Design a protein around this motif. Structure first.
Motif, short mmCIF file in Angstrom:
data_model
loop_
_atom_site.label_atom_id
_atom_site.label_comp_id
_atom_site.label_asym_id
_atom_site.label_seq_id
_atom_site.Cartn_x
_atom_site.Cartn_y
_atom_site.Cartn_z
N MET A 89 53.80 61.13 14.01
CA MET A 89 53.49 60.73 15.38
C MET A 89 54.43 59.58 15.75
O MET A 89 54.93 59.48 16.89
N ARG A 105 51.01 63.69 9.18
CA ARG A 105 50.69 63.78 10.60
C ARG A 105 50.98 62.41 11.20
O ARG A 105 51.69 62.28 12.23
N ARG A 106 50.44 61.36 10.58
CA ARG A 106 50.49 60.11 11.27
C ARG A 106 51.92 59.52 11.20
O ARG A 106 52.45 59.05 12.21
CL LIG Z 1 44.90 60.14 15.92
#
Ligand SMILES: [Cl-]
Ligand SMILES: [Cl-]
Lengths: 303, 303
Positions: B50, B46-47
């Motif tokens: 991003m 996820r990170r």
């Molecule tokens: Cl976050």
């Protein structure tokens, strides 16, 4: 025995996070919850695939436009150079045209002052010819009067010659007395004849001379035609100049309006120069912007 | 058994991430079990995502910018390209109306030149004519001078005849009526001599008149002579001057021809840039499209 697969899937995720997109996703065949999750992950892997693909096509598109702007730029460049060169060639010329126009105007203004001068010295010479014409007429009159009186003196001589006859005939009335008388009558005859000689010489001279006055008169009269004719041709010269002056301060204001449109044009050329430098900068920026986008997804090994 | 709920949940988290949806944190990171390890795995991804997403979002915004800049850069160019066309209009027009007047000048120069040269020929024939007069005047005058010299002899003779006859009359009437006859004849001779002397004075004073008028007239045609001289050197100067304008007007028309050509060169350029103008509107629209593709490649779009 659930531990083993979900750890394997965990590894698969890891392998994807490192950008390994080409390896199969395990456990998609199971009909347990693990299968549901594996399917989810294979879907991830596919969804990432398509994304990297899109970004990469985007990078290559832009790299294409960067390249296209670039060569469109290198053209507008040398084409813009050409323009500024062409524009100085026409600047040079408008400077020569003001030079040449200004000169032509002074050169007309000279001729004009010069011709009016001929005009005024021709009119003066006109009046001097008048006087000469007149004085020729007088000489003509005097000369004819001389022909006339000299013909009278020829008459008198003839007549006094006749009286010498009578005096001879009156003398011989006393022979030995009118001897002296006879000599006088002889003398008279001799005096008449010399006097007629002189008369006739004068006739020749004066008739000739009368020829001369009438010729000199026609010459002088033509000398007057001449003054009139000059005045005429010199006036028409003065007009022609009035017209050159008018077409010169005319050309003057047209050169003027051109120098203006030219200032316009090297202003816009100058700006095109600016546009070019900027457009090169845009291209460079685009190229690098594609480089970054490509790099942003380059760790990903696809298909 | 119990632990199938987190399996399914993780599956859902993964479907969000696949969908481009990153904002939600993954659940179950707190577990010691195998799930925990996997939740942590999804979290790491996820990170990472991003971050990758954000460079790309930044990438596209820069393209969007670049593009609309190129765009405005291109709108200015367009309006400078019509402004250039329109300027090149006025210029071509001005060369037209200035090619008219250069011709008008070479004509009026030519036409003046002839007029001047025409007066030059005239005032020169004129000077030859004035010369012929000054000569005829010398003739007329030499002759009068000759007539004077002879007229004087006729005076001499008259004088002598007067005395001769007066003495003869006196000495005849002295004789009484015997010499009345002679006395009358002598008398008519005396009268004839008187007439003749008086005629000869009239001629003498008329000769005086002629000679005087000749000297005067002669001095006047001299000056007329010199006024034609003055005219020649004036109109000649004017002929020279026309030469100088035929020049100007020749180098001028060569000026019009340089400018004519260079105005054509810059006609090419103007049209070519018009090509560039819309070619690049179209690059700018294509760039705008790639920006759009790039943001949509990574949007929260529910894919
Ligand atoms: Cl976050
Ligand atoms: Cl001029």
């Amino acid at each position: 025995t659930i531990t083993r697969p979900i750890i394997e899937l965990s590894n698969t995720v890891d392998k994807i996070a490192e950008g390994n997109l080409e390896a199969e996703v395990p456990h998609q065949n199971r009909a347990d919850e693990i299968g549901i999750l594996a399917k989810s992950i294979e879907r991830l892997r596919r969804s990432l695939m398509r994304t990297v693909g899109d970004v990469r096509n985007g990078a290559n598109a832009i790299y294409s436009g960067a390249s296209e702007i670039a060569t469109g730029n290198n053209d507008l460049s040398s084409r813009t150079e050409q323009q500024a060169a062409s524009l100085e060639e026409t600047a040079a010329s408008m400077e020569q045209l003001t030079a040449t126009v200004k000169q032509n105007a002074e050169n007309a203004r000279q001729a004009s002052h010069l011709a009016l001068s001929a005009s005024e010295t021709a009119q003066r010479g006109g009046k001097v010819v008048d006087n000469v014409v007149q004085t020729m007429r007088d000489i003509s009159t005097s000369s004819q009067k001389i022909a006339d009186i000299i013909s009278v003196i020829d008459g008198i001589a003839f007549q006094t010659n006749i009286l010498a006859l009578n005096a001879a005939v009156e003398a011989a009335r006393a022979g030995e007395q009118g001897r002296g008388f006879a000599v006088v009558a002889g003398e008279v005859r001799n005096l008449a004849q010399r006097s007629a000689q002189a008369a006739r010489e004068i006739k020749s001279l004066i008739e000739d001379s009368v020829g001369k006055v009438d010729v000199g008169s026609t010459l002088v009269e033509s000398a007057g035609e001449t003054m009139a004719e000059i005045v005429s041709a010199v006036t028409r010269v003065t007009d022609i100049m009035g017209e050159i002056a008018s077409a010169s301060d005319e050309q003057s204001r047209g050169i003027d309006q051109v120098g203006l449109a030219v200032a316009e044009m090297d202003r816009v050329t100058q700006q095109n120069a600016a546009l070019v430098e900027e457009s090169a900068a845009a291209a460079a920026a685009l190229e690098e912007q594609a480089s970054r986008l490509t790099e942003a997804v380059a760790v990903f090994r696809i298909q």
